[PDB]
Amino acid sequence: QRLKVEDALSYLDQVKLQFGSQPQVYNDFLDIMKEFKSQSIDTPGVISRVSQLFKGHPDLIMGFNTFLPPG
Numbered sequence: 001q002r003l004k005v006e007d008a009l010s011y012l013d014q015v016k017l018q019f020g021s022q023p024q025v026y027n028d029f030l031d032i033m034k035e036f037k038s039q040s041i042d043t044p045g046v047i048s049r050v051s052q053l054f055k056g057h058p059d060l061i062m063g064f065n066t067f068l069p070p071g
Contacts, residue, residue, distance in 0.1 A: 011064065
């Protein structure tokens, strides 16, 4: 069902704010996240991809880092 959404749309919103001219960036972030949740990739995979995704903005990087689930 998936209906538990409260602090999930917190970081995503920030990403959409800093990037509104390039819809390819946001769509790319969503795809990567879906791949990780699908057990398709590993932890270092999603972390590395997101890290390179936001090259120049350490804000979004640190945000996703502290947003990572308990491993």
